[PDB]
Structure 1
Amino acid sequence: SMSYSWTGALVTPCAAEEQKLPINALSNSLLRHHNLVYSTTSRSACQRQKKVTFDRLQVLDSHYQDVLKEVKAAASKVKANLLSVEEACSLTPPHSAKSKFGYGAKDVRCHARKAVAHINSVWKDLLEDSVTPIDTTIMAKNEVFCVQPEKRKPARLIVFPDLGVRVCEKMALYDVVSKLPLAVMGSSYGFQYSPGQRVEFLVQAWKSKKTPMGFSYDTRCFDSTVTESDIRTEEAIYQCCDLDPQARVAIKSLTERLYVGGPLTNSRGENCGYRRCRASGVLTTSCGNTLTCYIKARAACRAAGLQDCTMLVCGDDLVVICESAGVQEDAASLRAFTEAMTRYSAPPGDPPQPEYDLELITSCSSNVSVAHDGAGKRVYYLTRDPTTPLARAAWETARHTPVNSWLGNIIMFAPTLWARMILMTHFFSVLIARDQLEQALNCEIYGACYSIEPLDLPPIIQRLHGLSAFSLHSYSPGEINRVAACLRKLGVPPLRAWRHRARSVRARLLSRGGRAAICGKYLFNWAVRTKLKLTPIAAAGRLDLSGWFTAGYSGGDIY
């Protein structure tokens, strides 16, 4: 079956969409080459629709069936609870698409009477009807990128049910999604890790092999490759859990009326077509993709005969580290792995490449790199090309955005040369200029939403990355060059200009005392020759990373 069928109605916007990077003096101080920066809009939705629409080939073999049996046996050990309306209401991210039934995300989060009454009626309908297709809205996602030399990218398409339904999905399945992937894949479940644990996992996996070979596997439009039978098997896996009788019913209804497919409506209420694949904006998107990718990859590793595989899976992101059998055999065994994945309806985007250096693997848009701490000890950390984070940071300084990628990037990429010298310096000077140091901000990290005050960044970074995050130096030539080439391309000031700017930022923060002085001391110790002694921050031990800062969860894409 075709992943999509279209009517000719266009994917339409809700409000005006700006494609060009807006400019103000502060955003320009970060990046001057504004013409290279763009936002994706509904104008390119037609281009994305052609890429994501294809027929699926699915031939399951004994290797696939063997892994599915292990997953179902592992799933039987899970006990998951039905969430109450209130609980599901509190997990709703701020700014998620309002309901067409007269209430929005704010009403849901406040447990407003009107929102709760509607959600309750949606839930009763899921218990009484297991068949009628649920309507979905299709929107073109607005995301910021820098133009590429070889290739603007078309907008990604987001398919989501109404807000009331989204809350019901958490009531029936939030507890399943929070427990099932870890129970099923153990150490291979990538979402349990911080950046420091992911790097430790990859380095340890690499060192455990006699002659390691690794690869990232890029599935072409993963969501579209997900078949009706893949979605029905995810439901069969969910049912292996010890569940409440009402959750079992709602899970079946959600699968048959929404997850497997259904009608697509644009923002103007016109019929856009029909979906027979993964919806990008459902609670089970991330969990379902993680499970389905793990099943197909584990079976494909066996079908290819790859020796001693260690896998790390994050949604559709897959990385495999195995025991090399020589370059000719590895290239042939990777083609056999690809052929098996293709047969399982997971064909490649870019064909995988065997890598013999851990640093040359890109996975979760990142790579392993090395630096040294204050004692000169070797430290492995995760980094990436800063182009996209910098372009988005410039947009976010010119325009107030509900969700700030800059904050999530400073958090996830805190040990990096670029996040420290550029992102930290820039945002703390902008927060000083605007008097917003104490204002809590929203950010999203792979669907997990957080509400964080910039003044809490130092204890957050210490708890997440460790004290070494404030003392890394002696970055690699490749890393330095990648950042430096990025600055020249984007019109971003050189690192030495950022160092001088940071010394002024640092002084202003120190003079404010309290939490601001801690920001100046810890985050900007790299900017001074005469180093301050960085002792554990007391607030780092008091906090709880996972629970104190949570603003909810979106199982799939934005809105």
Structure 2
Amino acid sequence: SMSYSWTGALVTPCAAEEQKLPINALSNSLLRHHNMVYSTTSRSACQRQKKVTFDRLQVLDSHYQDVLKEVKAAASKVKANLLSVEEACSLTPPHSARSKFGYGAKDVRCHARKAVTHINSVWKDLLEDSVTPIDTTIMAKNEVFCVQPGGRKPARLIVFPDLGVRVCEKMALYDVVSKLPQAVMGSSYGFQYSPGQRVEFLVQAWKSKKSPMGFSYDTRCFDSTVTESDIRTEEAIYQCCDLDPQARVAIKSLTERLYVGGPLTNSKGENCGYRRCRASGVLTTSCGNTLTCYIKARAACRAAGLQDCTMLVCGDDLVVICESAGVQEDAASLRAFTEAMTRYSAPPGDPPQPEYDLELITSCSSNVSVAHDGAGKRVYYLTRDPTTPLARAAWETARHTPVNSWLGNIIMFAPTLWARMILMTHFFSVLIARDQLEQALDCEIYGACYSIEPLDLPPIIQRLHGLSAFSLHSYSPGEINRVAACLRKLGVPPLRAWRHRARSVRAKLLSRGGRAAICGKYLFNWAVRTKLKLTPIAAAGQLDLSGWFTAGYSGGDIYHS
């Protein structure tokens, strides 16, 4: 079966799409080489369509079936509930795509009668029709990157059903996709961990091995590798739970009418083609991808003869750490792993490489690195190449965007050199300049949208990373070099310039008192030689962070609050 078939109609925009980073004084103060920063647009959709379109050959075997049985057995212990229309409405993001039926996200969030009447009709139709494919829209994502001269990445494609259907997905499946993944994959389910917990997991997994070896496995176009049988298997797993009778009907209908495939319509209403793989923009994308990746990977580890594996799975992202059998044996085992994954429909982009140092493994864009606290104690933390974060931060300074990656990056990468010295300094300075310090902003954590107050960053950071996040120094030479080269590449001022700026920002924050002063004291202690004593933040204990690290929701149109 082909992942997609196409009619020749274009993937079309629904508004003008700005291509190049605009010139703005505040954005330019972060990053000057604006010609190297671009947004993907519908203009490159054809290139992406070509890449994501291929035939899937899938052959399953006894290891695969053995793992599937384990998963179904674990699922049978789960109880999940329906959400009410009101509950589902409250999970809809404020800038969720408008319905084609005359209402938008705001109407959903305020339980407007036109929205609710339509939602109720969609629900009824799910209960009454289990077969007619549901329409989806195909759009080109507008995402910002820095050039790497094949130059520019083509746009990723998002495929999503109508707003009314999305609310019904929440009613049928929000509780399932929030509970089931952790229950059936246990410690391997990556989205249950804060950043601090994720680094603890990876480090302990590595340390526990006599002679560790690890790798990341990069499936080429994972969504396109997911077969109709994969998606029906997911449905069978969902049905192992104790569910409400109406949920069972809706879940089957959603599977058969939406998740397994369906027609692709552009923003002009034209038929673009037909999908027989994973939809990138449905509630079950993260759960389904994670389950499918886990099942295939766990089976493939057995096929590969890998010894004492520890896996960490987040959607299509897979890390395995295991006991080395020797260099040639390990290399052969990774070839066998790849052959198994390939048989299961998931061949690699880049072939996996065995790594014998933890820092060399990249997972969810990130690698483990080490710094030191004030007493010379090694502290592990997750970092990443800052290029994309910085490029997006510059864009988000020049233009108002619905969701701010910069805030998510500060939250998730708070212990890093670059988040601390550059992102914190820049954004506190911009927020002060624009008189926006007190304003909550939308960002994403594991794909769910949150409204977060920047003045709450210090206790958030303490909870996610530990108090040491405000005291790290003596970073690794390789990390320092990577950041430095990024700054030269992008025309970002050097770190010592940011330090000078941070001293001013800090004094301004301290002068304001309250939460602002806590931001000055804790976030910018690094910028002064005469340091303040950083004691545990009282507010940290009081923060309700329930649901932050429960499940992944990228593509699933979820808002938490």
Output the TM-score relative to the length of structure 1. Answer: 0.98
Report if the CA contact (8 A) 1:93-1:552 is conserved. no
Distance 2:550 2:57 in 1: 40
SS in 1 for 2:388: helix
The 10-residue stretch of structure 1 (108-117 or 124-133) with the greater mean CA deviation from structure 2: 108-117
Report if the CA contact (8 A) 2:227-2:277 is conserved. yes
SS in 1 for 2:541: helix
Q: Which runs of 5+ in 1 are unaligned?
A: none
Deviation at 1:125, TM superposition (A): 0.4
Distance 2:549 2:185 in 1: 27
Please list the CA deviations of residues 330-354 of structure 1 after superposition, one character each: whole Å capped at 9, or x if unmatched. Answer: 1111000000000000010110000
- In structure 2, the residue matched to 1:266 is 266
Report if the CA contact (8 A) 2:137-2:264 is conserved. yes
Distance 2:95 2:554 in 1: 11
Q: Which runs of 5+ in 2 are unaligned?
A: none
Please list the CA deviations of residues 305-357 of structure 1 after superposition, one character each: whole Å capped at 9, or x if unmatched. Answer: 11000000000000000100111111111000000000000010110000000
Deviation at 1:445, TM superposition (A): 2.1
Distance 1:212 1:551 in 2: 28
Cα 1:434–1:551, aligned 2, differ >3 Å: closer, same or farther?
Answer: farther
Report if the CA contact (8 A) 2:372-2:472 is conserved. yes
Deviation at 1:149, TM superposition (A): 3.1
Output the TM-score relative to the length of structure 2. Answer: 0.98
Report if the CA contact (8 A) 1:212-1:323 is conserved. yes
Distance 2:408 2:71 in 1: 32
Report if the CA contact (8 A) 1:19-1:40 is conserved. yes
Report if the CA contact (8 A) 1:450-1:551 is conserved. no
Report if the CA contact (8 A) 2:411-2:461 is conserved. yes
Cα 1:220–1:89, aligned 2, differ >3 Å: closer, same or farther?
Answer: same
SS in 1 for 2:536: coil
Report if the CA contact (8 A) 1:464-1:545 is conserved. no
Deviation at 1:556, TM superposition (A): 3.6
Cα 1:34–1:222, aligned 2, differ >3 Å: closer, same or farther?
Answer: same
Cα 1:465–1:310, aligned 2, differ >3 Å: closer, same or farther?
Answer: same
Distance 1:365 1:450 in 2: 21
Distance 1:554 1:483 in 2: 27
SS in 1 for 2:449: strand
Distance 2:49 2:288 in 1: 22
Please list the CA deviations of residues 83-112 of structure 1 after superposition, one character each: whole Å capped at 9, or x if unmatched. Answer: 111001111122110101111111111122
Cα 1:348–1:553, aligned 2, differ >3 Å: closer, same or farther?
Answer: closer
Report if the CA contact (8 A) 1:20-1:35 is conserved. yes
Report if the CA contact (8 A) 1:92-1:552 is conserved. no
Deviation at 1:554, TM superposition (A): 5.5
Distance 1:551 1:96 in 2: 20
Report if the CA contact (8 A) 1:303-1:340 is conserved. yes
Cα 1:549–1:517, aligned 2, differ >3 Å: closer, same or farther?
Answer: farther
Report if the CA contact (8 A) 1:259-1:278 is conserved. yes
Deviation at 1:446, TM superposition (A): 2.7
Report if the CA contact (8 A) 1:93-1:553 is conserved. no
SS in 2 for 1:536: coil
Distance 1:497 1:429 in 2: 14
Cα 1:368–1:344, aligned 2, differ >3 Å: closer, same or farther?
Answer: same
- In structure 2, the residue matched to 1:243 is 243
Deviation at 1:34, TM superposition (A): 0.4
Distance 2:445 2:223 in 1: 19
Deviation at 1:461, TM superposition (A): 0.8
Cα 1:551–1:226, aligned 2, differ >3 Å: closer, same or farther?
Answer: closer
Percent of counterpart pairs with the same letter?
Answer: 98
Cα 1:51–1:556, aligned 2, differ >3 Å: closer, same or farther?
Answer: farther
SS in 2 for 1:551: coil
Distance 2:149 2:356 in 1: 27
Deviation at 1:557, TM superposition (A): 7.5
Please list the CA deviations of residues 177-236 of structure 1 after superposition, one character each: whole Å capped at 9, or x if unmatched. Answer: 011111101000000011111110000000111100000000000000000000000000
Deviation at 1:449, TM superposition (A): 1.1
Report if the CA contact (8 A) 1:281-1:558 is conserved. no
Deviation at 1:540, TM superposition (A): 1.1
Distance 1:78 1:435 in 2: 48
Deviation at 1:374, TM superposition (A): 1.8
Cα 1:551–1:248, aligned 2, differ >3 Å: closer, same or farther?
Answer: closer
Distance 2:554 2:355 in 1: 34
Deviation at 1:363, TM superposition (A): 0.4
Cα 1:38–1:186, aligned 2, differ >3 Å: closer, same or farther?
Answer: same
Distance 2:5 2:552 in 1: 33
- In structure 1, the residue matched to 2:389 is 389
SS in 2 for 1:552: coil
The 10-residue stretch of structure 1 (548-557 or 159-168) with the greater mean CA deviation from structure 2: 548-557
The 10-residue stretch of structure 1 (329-338 or 538-547) with the greater mean CA deviation from structure 2: 538-547
Cα 1:189–1:309, aligned 2, differ >3 Å: closer, same or farther?
Answer: same
SS in 2 for 1:2: coil
Corresponding pairs, count: 559
The 10-residue stretch of structure 1 (437-446 or 217-226) with the greater mean CA deviation from structure 2: 437-446
Cα 1:315–1:137, aligned 2, differ >3 Å: closer, same or farther?
Answer: same
Report if the CA contact (8 A) 2:448-2:558 is conserved. no
Cα 1:24–1:426, aligned 2, differ >3 Å: closer, same or farther?
Answer: same
Please list the CA deviations of residues 383-417 of structure 1 after superposition, one character each: whole Å capped at 9, or x if unmatched. Answer: 00000000000000000111000000000000000
Report if the CA contact (8 A) 2:146-2:388 is conserved. yes
Report if the CA contact (8 A) 1:330-1:354 is conserved. yes
Deviation at 1:546, TM superposition (A): 2.8
Report if the CA contact (8 A) 2:286-2:554 is conserved. no
Deviation at 1:444, TM superposition (A): 1.1
Distance 1:22 1:550 in 2: 37
The 10-residue stretch of structure 1 (144-153 or 302-311) with the greater mean CA deviation from structure 2: 144-153
The 10-residue stretch of structure 1 (541-550 or 504-513) with the greater mean CA deviation from structure 2: 541-550
SS in 2 for 1:428: helix
Report if the CA contact (8 A) 1:280-1:557 is conserved. no
Report if the CA contact (8 A) 1:450-1:550 is conserved. no
Deviation at 1:531, TM superposition (A): 0.3
TM superposition outliers: structure 1 runs of 4+ over 4 Å: 547-555
Distance 2:550 2:186 in 1: 24
- In structure 2, the residue matched to 1:27 is 27
Deviation at 1:164, TM superposition (A): 0.3
SS in 2 for 1:499: helix
- In structure 2, the residue matched to 1:541 is 541
Please list the CA deviations of residues 129-149 of structure 1 after superposition, one character each: whole Å capped at 9, or x if unmatched. Answer: 000110000000000000013
